[PDB]
Amino acid sequence: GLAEKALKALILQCEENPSLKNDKDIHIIINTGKKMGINRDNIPRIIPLTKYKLFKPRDLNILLITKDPSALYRETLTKDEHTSELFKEIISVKNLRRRFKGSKLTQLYKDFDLVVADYRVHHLLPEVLGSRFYHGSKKLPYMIRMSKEVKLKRQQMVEKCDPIYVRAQLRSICKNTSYIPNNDNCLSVRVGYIQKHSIPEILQNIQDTINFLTDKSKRPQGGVIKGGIISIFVKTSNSTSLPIYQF
Amino acid sequence: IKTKKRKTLKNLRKDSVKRGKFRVQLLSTTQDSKTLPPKKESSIIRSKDRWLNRKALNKG
Amino acid sequence: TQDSNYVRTLRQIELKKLEKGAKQLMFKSSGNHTIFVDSREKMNEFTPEKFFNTTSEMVNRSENRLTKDQLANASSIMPKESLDKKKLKKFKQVKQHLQRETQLKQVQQRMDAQRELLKKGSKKKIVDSSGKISFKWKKQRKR
Amino acid sequence: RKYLNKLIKRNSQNLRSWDLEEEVRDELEDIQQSILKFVKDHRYPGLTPGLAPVGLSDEEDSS
Amino acid sequence: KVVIEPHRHAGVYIARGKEDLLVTKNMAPGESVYGEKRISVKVEYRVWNPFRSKLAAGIMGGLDELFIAPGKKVLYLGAASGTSVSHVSDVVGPEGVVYAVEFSHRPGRELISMAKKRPNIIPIIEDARHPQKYRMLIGMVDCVFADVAQPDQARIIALNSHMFLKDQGGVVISIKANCIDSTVDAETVFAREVQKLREERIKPLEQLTLEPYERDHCIVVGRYMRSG
RNA sequence: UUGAGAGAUACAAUUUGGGAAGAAAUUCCCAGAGUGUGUUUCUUUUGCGUUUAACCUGAACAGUCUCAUCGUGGGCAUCUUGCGAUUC
């Protein structure tokens, strides 16, 4: 129950403090003992929640970024009934680099809510995006395999898509959350909204997250913890640390 | 019921029990082997009489 | 032509090493193993143990069936982890050699057809509608 | 009697441990048969962690 | 480094070394027949290949009562190249002897060269089909091995059964289905063959297919029982 | 969705035979065997509909000249990134 009292302390101090109202998320920061192996790129790997949802694709504004020609992409995703109301805007990379420059990029950041791009263009994406999006780790775009078809060696790649599959993929990544792999010991992960759900949801959230990150299997995503997790601190971006689970 | 006792007629009549990897069948009786010409070939005689009474000639 | 020679030489090398391997090796047999008897009651009463008078594992082994009276590994160094490792190593080496041989003969055949593609005649290119490229010569006896 | 069968059993243990194998002999069965007879890319390895292992419930369901 | 293990039958040893192997105590050491290797432990020991020897396919196929022993006399119908028959001379050792027969003349010369070297083999170089020409020189064999591809195996083996078989004796035939009939199924052809021998007084006991060595060969082990 | 038969089974219960502990009743190693449904594989039968089907063959690539091979240069790194193989 000490965890829950500390969460009560955090949320009530969030109510009183003028700065703490103006940032509206909760981050769990973990310190373990050992440094982690994989170098820090910027592919946010996802983490599942089992009992509690977090956000809705029918609740956030979405940007999609394509391959080059984007014609069948835009028209099919617009016209075929599973994604007709989903994405705010679809645009290709070349069209983006032509269209937005500097202050226009900052206006994009101010306006749009969550960004997803094709896997085959994520590697180049942050260079046209710059580092205003790449301040820290909130608005990191994800990557989505569009066609449910795989390119073998020495064979021409087939173009297709399906709104079915892309809608399921967005509903997964918007239901549950994502973390970033590092090299140093300390790490951070966004968990939950202060009003969208409550303290039991947050505790169950933390339990499932630490369980999925402790589990030995599912290794490309969930085997991130090496050594023992020392402690978990709950904090906002502008609040302070509250210590739980110290051993 | 009586269907399964028809199959147990097959059971009392059959001559091959497998014991896992191994198998035992026994030697047919001398008087049978000596005082009967052996049985006919079902597949071959069926083939020849099928060739006779095929549908390609409108017999009957 | 010298390339076809070199690849052929290495292919024969691998073939002979595979044959010497198969000669020095030892497999295990599993075929139809029937046993006759004269009574159907004695047949239904047959038991492999009560016929061979051996143990469980001696019955279940077929490449070696010594009776208990004839039964009437310490020098072998760690048979639990080492000797099975070496048996598996020999058999995996032979499998590797066979696979290598198949690869080599494939490359040799492609190179041989290409080498024959250079001499004489009247050639004709077809595409086998699976997607193969091949040739066919005109009906033309050389002098 | 039990002693006779004991000497026998010792011999059986010797023979068994010399000869037998479990899954190693199965691997040997694989090798012997062949001797006597998942979403990744080829060029992009960041995808196979970066993807989302989507749920058939999150597909078929309409929220 | 290598250890031995004796077999159910005499003369037969399984060598447990760097690989398990089927081996027999040599008669004379340091002398090859078909380019095989050796192993010693001092005692000298000669391999068989279950491929190139059909009885080698039998032993590691597993046969309960093979009627070979050291001090006996065996008949071998079909000793081409002399390999398995020189090996059978090995397993009967010094005291026993084998009478091999053969008809084609290239393995004839090969077997007679092995007869020049090894004593316990006595060769007869005839067509098998008229046993008078070797009942002048053979008397009262104990056991019989028959690997002849001719389809009248029953006739030729019944002939040598009436002529030379020891009473209550042991006989082993090999059967190639794809040589006798070459269209139909293995156990079918086998049952027909052992029917032939049963009518020809040979009481069979077991048969066994040699699967991972041969293409649908089997061997039939039986006895000669109260017969002349 | 006409019959018959053969085999692999998965599970559910059933059961032979050797070793081993058992004062004993009972239990554990093994090699098994039969029954229930289910998963079939194959053989075969029955009816109905149908008379061709498939592959080859001769003077069957080629003036918008074709094809083989070695080389030169260019795109495709938002990827057919190309195997002694044929990226275009």
PDB file of N, CA and C in Angstrom, chain C residues 53-132:
ATOM      1  N   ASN C  53      14.852 -64.915 -24.081  1.00  0.00           N
ATOM      2  CA  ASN C  53      15.371 -65.020 -22.720  1.00  0.00           C
ATOM      3  C   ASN C  53      16.449 -63.969 -22.459  1.00  0.00           C
ATOM      4  N   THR C  54      16.110 -62.723 -22.771  1.00  0.00           N
ATOM      5  CA  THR C  54      17.059 -61.636 -22.579  1.00  0.00           C
ATOM      6  C   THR C  54      16.402 -60.529 -21.774  1.00  0.00           C
ATOM      7  N   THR C  55      17.065 -59.393 -21.647  1.00  0.00           N
ATOM      8  CA  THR C  55      16.533 -58.316 -20.834  1.00  0.00           C
ATOM      9  C   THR C  55      15.582 -57.476 -21.667  1.00  0.00           C
ATOM     10  N   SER C  56      15.036 -56.456 -21.020  1.00  0.00           N
ATOM     11  CA  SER C  56      14.254 -55.417 -21.660  1.00  0.00           C
ATOM     12  C   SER C  56      15.042 -54.777 -22.786  1.00  0.00           C
ATOM     13  N   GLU C  57      16.178 -54.185 -22.431  1.00  0.00           N
ATOM     14  CA  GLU C  57      16.925 -53.419 -23.412  1.00  0.00           C
ATOM     15  C   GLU C  57      17.622 -54.328 -24.409  1.00  0.00           C
ATOM     16  N   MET C  58      17.933 -55.563 -24.020  1.00  0.00           N
ATOM     17  CA  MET C  58      18.508 -56.499 -24.982  1.00  0.00           C
ATOM     18  C   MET C  58      17.473 -56.946 -26.011  1.00  0.00           C
ATOM     19  N   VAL C  59      16.213 -57.099 -25.584  1.00  0.00           N
ATOM     20  CA  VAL C  59      15.127 -57.347 -26.532  1.00  0.00           C
ATOM     21  C   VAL C  59      14.970 -56.161 -27.465  1.00  0.00           C
ATOM     22  N   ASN C  60      14.899 -54.962 -26.894  1.00  0.00           N
ATOM     23  CA  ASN C  60      14.617 -53.789 -27.703  1.00  0.00           C
ATOM     24  C   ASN C  60      15.766 -53.440 -28.636  1.00  0.00           C
ATOM     25  N   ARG C  61      16.987 -53.818 -28.287  1.00  0.00           N
ATOM     26  CA  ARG C  61      18.104 -53.746 -29.210  1.00  0.00           C
ATOM     27  C   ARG C  61      18.026 -54.909 -30.179  1.00  0.00           C
ATOM     28  N   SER C  62      18.278 -54.624 -31.451  1.00  0.00           N
ATOM     29  CA  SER C  62      18.276 -55.679 -32.452  1.00  0.00           C
ATOM     30  C   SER C  62      19.669 -55.931 -33.008  1.00  0.00           C
ATOM     31  N   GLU C  63      20.536 -54.924 -32.963  1.00  0.00           N
ATOM     32  CA  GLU C  63      21.888 -55.122 -33.455  1.00  0.00           C
ATOM     33  C   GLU C  63      22.740 -55.888 -32.461  1.00  0.00           C
ATOM     34  N   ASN C  64      22.232 -56.113 -31.258  1.00  0.00           N
ATOM     35  CA  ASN C  64      22.948 -56.910 -30.271  1.00  0.00           C
ATOM     36  C   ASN C  64      21.926 -57.554 -29.354  1.00  0.00           C
ATOM     37  N   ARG C  65      21.832 -58.876 -29.398  1.00  0.00           N
ATOM     38  CA  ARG C  65      20.923 -59.605 -28.524  1.00  0.00           C
ATOM     39  C   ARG C  65      21.714 -60.749 -27.892  1.00  0.00           C
ATOM     40  N   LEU C  66      22.331 -60.465 -26.755  1.00  0.00           N
ATOM     41  CA  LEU C  66      23.014 -61.511 -26.011  1.00  0.00           C
ATOM     42  C   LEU C  66      22.159 -61.963 -24.837  1.00  0.00           C
ATOM     43  N   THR C  67      22.088 -63.273 -24.650  1.00  0.00           N
ATOM     44  CA  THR C  67      21.264 -63.809 -23.584  1.00  0.00           C
ATOM     45  C   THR C  67      21.877 -63.495 -22.225  1.00  0.00           C
ATOM     46  N   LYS C  68      21.051 -63.613 -21.180  1.00  0.00           N
ATOM     47  CA  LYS C  68      21.461 -63.217 -19.835  1.00  0.00           C
ATOM     48  C   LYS C  68      22.640 -64.044 -19.354  1.00  0.00           C
ATOM     49  N   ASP C  69      22.592 -65.344 -19.628  1.00  0.00           N
ATOM     50  CA  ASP C  69      23.702 -66.227 -19.315  1.00  0.00           C
ATOM     51  C   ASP C  69      24.963 -65.809 -20.054  1.00  0.00           C
ATOM     52  N   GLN C  70      24.812 -65.199 -21.230  1.00  0.00           N
ATOM     53  CA  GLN C  70      25.988 -64.732 -21.947  1.00  0.00           C
ATOM     54  C   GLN C  70      26.454 -63.387 -21.407  1.00  0.00           C
ATOM     55  N   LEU C  71      25.548 -62.628 -20.792  1.00  0.00           N
ATOM     56  CA  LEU C  71      25.968 -61.443 -20.054  1.00  0.00           C
ATOM     57  C   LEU C  71      26.803 -61.839 -18.846  1.00  0.00           C
ATOM     58  N   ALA C  72      26.485 -62.984 -18.251  1.00  0.00           N
ATOM     59  CA  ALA C  72      27.284 -63.518 -17.151  1.00  0.00           C
ATOM     60  C   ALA C  72      28.708 -63.851 -17.587  1.00  0.00           C
ATOM     61  N   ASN C  73      32.694 -49.908 -19.911  1.00  0.00           N
ATOM     62  CA  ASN C  73      32.464 -48.504 -20.232  1.00  0.00           C
ATOM     63  C   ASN C  73      33.354 -47.607 -19.383  1.00  0.00           C
ATOM     64  N   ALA C  74      34.036 -48.213 -18.415  1.00  0.00           N
ATOM     65  CA  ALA C  74      34.865 -47.461 -17.481  1.00  0.00           C
ATOM     66  C   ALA C  74      36.114 -46.882 -18.128  1.00  0.00           C
ATOM     67  N   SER C  75      36.733 -47.605 -19.062  1.00  0.00           N
ATOM     68  CA  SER C  75      37.831 -47.018 -19.822  1.00  0.00           C
ATOM     69  C   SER C  75      37.323 -45.905 -20.726  1.00  0.00           C
ATOM     70  N   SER C  76      36.066 -45.998 -21.159  1.00  0.00           N
ATOM     71  CA  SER C  76      35.477 -44.976 -22.009  1.00  0.00           C
ATOM     72  C   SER C  76      35.185 -43.722 -21.201  1.00  0.00           C
ATOM     73  N   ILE C  77      35.757 -42.633 -21.645  1.00  0.00           N
ATOM     74  CA  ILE C  77      35.894 -41.424 -20.852  1.00  0.00           C
ATOM     75  C   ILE C  77      34.672 -40.554 -21.078  1.00  0.00           C
ATOM     76  N   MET C  78      33.848 -40.419 -20.036  1.00  0.00           N
ATOM     77  CA  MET C  78      32.586 -39.683 -20.041  1.00  0.00           C
ATOM     78  C   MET C  78      31.686 -40.094 -21.202  1.00  0.00           C
ATOM     79  N   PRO C  79      31.117 -41.302 -21.194  1.00  0.00           N
ATOM     80  CA  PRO C  79      30.188 -41.669 -22.271  1.00  0.00           C
ATOM     81  C   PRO C  79      28.886 -40.897 -22.237  1.00  0.00           C
ATOM     82  N   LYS C  80      28.583 -40.204 -21.143  1.00  0.00           N
ATOM     83  CA  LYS C  80      27.378 -39.401 -21.059  1.00  0.00           C
ATOM     84  C   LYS C  80      27.419 -38.173 -21.954  1.00  0.00           C
ATOM     85  N   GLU C  81      28.570 -37.515 -22.084  1.00  0.00           N
ATOM     86  CA  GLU C  81      28.595 -36.224 -22.758  1.00  0.00           C
ATOM     87  C   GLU C  81      29.561 -36.213 -23.933  1.00  0.00           C
ATOM     88  N   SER C  82      30.544 -37.112 -23.928  1.00  0.00           N
ATOM     89  CA  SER C  82      31.640 -37.008 -24.882  1.00  0.00           C
ATOM     90  C   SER C  82      31.488 -37.964 -26.063  1.00  0.00           C
ATOM     91  N   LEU C  83      31.209 -39.241 -25.801  1.00  0.00           N
ATOM     92  CA  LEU C  83      31.239 -40.227 -26.878  1.00  0.00           C
ATOM     93  C   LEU C  83      30.017 -40.098 -27.781  1.00  0.00           C
ATOM     94  N   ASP C  84      28.864 -39.760 -27.203  1.00  0.00           N
ATOM     95  CA  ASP C  84      27.717 -39.419 -28.035  1.00  0.00           C
ATOM     96  C   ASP C  84      28.000 -38.173 -28.857  1.00  0.00           C
ATOM     97  N   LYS C  85      28.745 -37.227 -28.277  1.00  0.00           N
ATOM     98  CA  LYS C  85      29.145 -36.033 -29.009  1.00  0.00           C
ATOM     99  C   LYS C  85      29.994 -36.407 -30.215  1.00  0.00           C
ATOM    100  N   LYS C  86      30.907 -37.366 -30.047  1.00  0.00           N
ATOM    101  CA  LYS C  86      31.782 -37.751 -31.157  1.00  0.00           C
ATOM    102  C   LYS C  86      31.052 -38.566 -32.227  1.00  0.00           C
ATOM    103  N   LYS C  87      30.117 -39.435 -31.823  1.00  0.00           N
ATOM    104  CA  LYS C  87      29.274 -40.132 -32.793  1.00  0.00           C
ATOM    105  C   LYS C  87      28.479 -39.146 -33.630  1.00  0.00           C
ATOM    106  N   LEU C  88      27.802 -38.215 -32.956  1.00  0.00           N
ATOM    107  CA  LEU C  88      27.055 -37.193 -33.661  1.00  0.00           C
ATOM    108  C   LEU C  88      27.964 -36.342 -34.522  1.00  0.00           C
ATOM    109  N   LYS C  89      29.213 -36.155 -34.099  1.00  0.00           N
ATOM    110  CA  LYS C  89      30.146 -35.379 -34.899  1.00  0.00           C
ATOM    111  C   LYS C  89      30.491 -36.098 -36.197  1.00  0.00           C
ATOM    112  N   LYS C  90      30.719 -37.411 -36.134  1.00  0.00           N
ATOM    113  CA  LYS C  90      31.027 -38.139 -37.363  1.00  0.00           C
ATOM    114  C   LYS C  90      29.844 -38.136 -38.323  1.00  0.00           C
ATOM    115  N   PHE C  91      28.640 -38.366 -37.805  1.00  0.00           N
ATOM    116  CA  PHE C  91      27.489 -38.411 -38.701  1.00  0.00           C
ATOM    117  C   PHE C  91      27.181 -37.036 -39.279  1.00  0.00           C
ATOM    118  N   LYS C  92      27.386 -35.981 -38.489  1.00  0.00           N
ATOM    119  CA  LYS C  92      27.166 -34.641 -39.010  1.00  0.00           C
ATOM    120  C   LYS C  92      28.211 -34.283 -40.052  1.00  0.00           C
ATOM    121  N   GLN C  93      29.444 -34.771 -39.885  1.00  0.00           N
ATOM    122  CA  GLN C  93      30.456 -34.549 -40.910  1.00  0.00           C
ATOM    123  C   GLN C  93      30.059 -35.196 -42.224  1.00  0.00           C
ATOM    124  N   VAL C  94      29.522 -36.409 -42.158  1.00  0.00           N
ATOM    125  CA  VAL C  94      29.132 -37.093 -43.387  1.00  0.00           C
ATOM    126  C   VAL C  94      27.965 -36.383 -44.062  1.00  0.00           C
ATOM    127  N   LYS C  95      26.992 -35.928 -43.272  1.00  0.00           N
ATOM    128  CA  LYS C  95      25.881 -35.163 -43.834  1.00  0.00           C
ATOM    129  C   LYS C  95      26.370 -33.878 -44.499  1.00  0.00           C
ATOM    130  N   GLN C  96      27.293 -33.179 -43.838  1.00  0.00           N
ATOM    131  CA  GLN C  96      27.896 -31.977 -44.396  1.00  0.00           C
ATOM    132  C   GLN C  96      28.556 -32.264 -45.732  1.00  0.00           C
ATOM    133  N   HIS C  97      29.293 -33.373 -45.807  1.00  0.00           N
ATOM    134  CA  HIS C  97      29.997 -33.716 -47.035  1.00  0.00           C
ATOM    135  C   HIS C  97      29.025 -33.983 -48.169  1.00  0.00           C
ATOM    136  N   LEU C  98      27.932 -34.689 -47.872  1.00  0.00           N
ATOM    137  CA  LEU C  98      26.945 -34.970 -48.909  1.00  0.00           C
ATOM    138  C   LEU C  98      26.347 -33.681 -49.449  1.00  0.00           C
ATOM    139  N   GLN C  99      25.999 -32.764 -48.542  1.00  0.00           N
ATOM    140  CA  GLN C  99      25.392 -31.505 -48.962  1.00  0.00           C
ATOM    141  C   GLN C  99      26.368 -30.677 -49.797  1.00  0.00           C
ATOM    142  N   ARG C 100      27.640 -30.680 -49.394  1.00  0.00           N
ATOM    143  CA  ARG C 100      28.680 -30.014 -50.165  1.00  0.00           C
ATOM    144  C   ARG C 100      28.797 -30.607 -51.559  1.00  0.00           C
ATOM    145  N   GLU C 101      28.726 -31.933 -51.656  1.00  0.00           N
ATOM    146  CA  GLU C 101      28.803 -32.593 -52.949  1.00  0.00           C
ATOM    147  C   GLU C 101      27.669 -32.159 -53.859  1.00  0.00           C
ATOM    148  N   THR C 102      26.454 -32.084 -53.315  1.00  0.00           N
ATOM    149  CA  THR C 102      25.320 -31.674 -54.136  1.00  0.00           C
ATOM    150  C   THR C 102      25.509 -30.261 -54.663  1.00  0.00           C
ATOM    151  N   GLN C 103      25.977 -29.356 -53.801  1.00  0.00           N
ATOM    152  CA  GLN C 103      26.233 -27.993 -54.253  1.00  0.00           C
ATOM    153  C   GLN C 103      27.261 -27.964 -55.378  1.00  0.00           C
ATOM    154  N   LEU C 104      28.346 -28.720 -55.212  1.00  0.00           N
ATOM    155  CA  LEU C 104      29.410 -28.704 -56.206  1.00  0.00           C
ATOM    156  C   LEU C 104      28.936 -29.237 -57.540  1.00  0.00           C
ATOM    157  N   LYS C 105      28.175 -30.329 -57.532  1.00  0.00           N
ATOM    158  CA  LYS C 105      27.735 -30.891 -58.801  1.00  0.00           C
ATOM    159  C   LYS C 105      26.764 -29.955 -59.494  1.00  0.00           C
ATOM    160  N   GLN C 106      25.970 -29.214 -58.714  1.00  0.00           N
ATOM    161  CA  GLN C 106      25.106 -28.197 -59.306  1.00  0.00           C
ATOM    162  C   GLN C 106      25.912 -27.152 -60.064  1.00  0.00           C
ATOM    163  N   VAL C 107      26.939 -26.611 -59.413  1.00  0.00           N
ATOM    164  CA  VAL C 107      27.728 -25.571 -60.063  1.00  0.00           C
ATOM    165  C   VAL C 107      28.473 -26.139 -61.261  1.00  0.00           C
ATOM    166  N   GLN C 108      28.927 -27.387 -61.159  1.00  0.00           N
ATOM    167  CA  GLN C 108      29.633 -27.988 -62.281  1.00  0.00           C
ATOM    168  C   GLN C 108      28.717 -28.169 -63.477  1.00  0.00           C
ATOM    169  N   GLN C 109      27.464 -28.554 -63.241  1.00  0.00           N
ATOM    170  CA  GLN C 109      26.566 -28.771 -64.369  1.00  0.00           C
ATOM    171  C   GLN C 109      26.200 -27.464 -65.050  1.00  0.00           C
ATOM    172  N   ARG C 110      25.946 -26.415 -64.266  1.00  0.00           N
ATOM    173  CA  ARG C 110      25.658 -25.126 -64.886  1.00  0.00           C
ATOM    174  C   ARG C 110      26.846 -24.640 -65.708  1.00  0.00           C
ATOM    175  N   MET C 111      28.054 -24.783 -65.159  1.00  0.00           N
ATOM    176  CA  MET C 111      29.242 -24.377 -65.894  1.00  0.00           C
ATOM    177  C   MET C 111      29.455 -25.230 -67.133  1.00  0.00           C
ATOM    178  N   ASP C 112      29.082 -26.508 -67.081  1.00  0.00           N
ATOM    179  CA  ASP C 112      29.304 -27.385 -68.225  1.00  0.00           C
ATOM    180  C   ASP C 112      28.371 -27.044 -69.374  1.00  0.00           C
ATOM    181  N   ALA C 113      27.111 -26.753 -69.066  1.00  0.00           N
ATOM    182  CA  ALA C 113      26.201 -26.332 -70.122  1.00  0.00           C
ATOM    183  C   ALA C 113      26.677 -25.032 -70.751  1.00  0.00           C
ATOM    184  N   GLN C 114      27.135 -24.089 -69.920  1.00  0.00           N
ATOM    185  CA  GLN C 114      27.646 -22.842 -70.477  1.00  0.00           C
ATOM    186  C   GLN C 114      28.876 -23.073 -71.338  1.00  0.00           C
ATOM    187  N   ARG C 115      29.723 -24.029 -70.959  1.00  0.00           N
ATOM    188  CA  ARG C 115      30.897 -24.313 -71.775  1.00  0.00           C
ATOM    189  C   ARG C 115      30.512 -24.944 -73.096  1.00  0.00           C
ATOM    190  N   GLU C 116      29.476 -25.776 -73.099  1.00  0.00           N
ATOM    191  CA  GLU C 116      29.051 -26.356 -74.362  1.00  0.00           C
ATOM    192  C   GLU C 116      28.349 -25.328 -75.233  1.00  0.00           C
ATOM    193  N   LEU C 117      27.852 -24.250 -74.637  1.00  0.00           N
ATOM    194  CA  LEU C 117      27.183 -23.194 -75.385  1.00  0.00           C
ATOM    195  C   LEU C 117      28.064 -22.391 -76.337  1.00  0.00           C
ATOM    196  N   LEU C 118      29.315 -22.789 -76.527  1.00  0.00           N
ATOM    197  CA  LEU C 118      30.269 -21.970 -77.247  1.00  0.00           C
ATOM    198  C   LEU C 118      30.847 -22.615 -78.489  1.00  0.00           C
ATOM    199  N   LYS C 119      30.427 -23.818 -78.858  1.00  0.00           N
ATOM    200  CA  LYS C 119      31.169 -24.522 -79.899  1.00  0.00           C
ATOM    201  C   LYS C 119      30.611 -24.283 -81.297  1.00  0.00           C
ATOM    202  N   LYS C 120      29.409 -24.771 -81.571  1.00  0.00           N
ATOM    203  CA  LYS C 120      28.973 -24.902 -82.954  1.00  0.00           C
ATOM    204  C   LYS C 120      27.473 -25.171 -82.971  1.00  0.00           C
ATOM    205  N   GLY C 121      26.913 -25.320 -84.168  1.00  0.00           N
ATOM    206  CA  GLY C 121      25.520 -25.673 -84.328  1.00  0.00           C
ATOM    207  C   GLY C 121      24.639 -24.462 -84.554  1.00  0.00           C
ATOM    208  N   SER C 122      23.340 -24.677 -84.407  1.00  0.00           N
ATOM    209  CA  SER C 122      22.362 -23.597 -84.408  1.00  0.00           C
ATOM    210  C   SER C 122      21.562 -23.674 -83.118  1.00  0.00           C
ATOM    211  N   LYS C 123      21.715 -22.659 -82.280  1.00  0.00           N
ATOM    212  CA  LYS C 123      21.100 -22.672 -80.966  1.00  0.00           C
ATOM    213  C   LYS C 123      19.767 -21.949 -80.985  1.00  0.00           C
ATOM    214  N   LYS C 124      18.909 -22.281 -80.030  1.00  0.00           N
ATOM    215  CA  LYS C 124      17.572 -21.727 -79.960  1.00  0.00           C
ATOM    216  C   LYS C 124      17.189 -21.569 -78.499  1.00  0.00           C
ATOM    217  N   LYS C 125      16.816 -20.354 -78.100  1.00  0.00           N
ATOM    218  CA  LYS C 125      16.588 -20.042 -76.687  1.00  0.00           C
ATOM    219  C   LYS C 125      15.111 -20.182 -76.355  1.00  0.00           C
ATOM    220  N   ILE C 126      14.802 -20.991 -75.344  1.00  0.00           N
ATOM    221  CA  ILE C 126      13.434 -21.116 -74.864  1.00  0.00           C
ATOM    222  C   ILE C 126      13.364 -20.690 -73.411  1.00  0.00           C
ATOM    223  N   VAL C 127      12.184 -20.241 -73.018  1.00  0.00           N
ATOM    224  CA  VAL C 127      11.854 -19.971 -71.633  1.00  0.00           C
ATOM    225  C   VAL C 127      10.783 -20.967 -71.204  1.00  0.00           C
ATOM    226  N   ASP C 128      11.187 -21.923 -70.377  1.00  0.00           N
ATOM    227  CA  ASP C 128      10.231 -22.829 -69.767  1.00  0.00           C
ATOM    228  C   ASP C 128       9.338 -22.046 -68.823  1.00  0.00           C
ATOM    229  N   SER C 129       8.024 -22.192 -69.025  1.00  0.00           N
ATOM    230  CA  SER C 129       7.069 -21.212 -68.516  1.00  0.00           C
ATOM    231  C   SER C 129       6.990 -21.201 -66.992  1.00  0.00           C
ATOM    232  N   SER C 130       7.619 -22.168 -66.324  1.00  0.00           N
ATOM    233  CA  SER C 130       7.920 -21.994 -64.911  1.00  0.00           C
ATOM    234  C   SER C 130       8.844 -20.811 -64.679  1.00  0.00           C
ATOM    235  N   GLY C 131       9.667 -20.467 -65.660  1.00  0.00           N
ATOM    236  CA  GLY C 131      10.621 -19.394 -65.536  1.00  0.00           C
ATOM    237  C   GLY C 131      12.045 -19.802 -65.808  1.00  0.00           C
ATOM    238  N   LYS C 132      12.262 -20.982 -66.366  1.00  0.00           N
ATOM    239  CA  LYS C 132      13.608 -21.447 -66.627  1.00  0.00           C
ATOM    240  C   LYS C 132      14.085 -20.896 -67.958  1.00  0.00           C
TER     241      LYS C 132
END
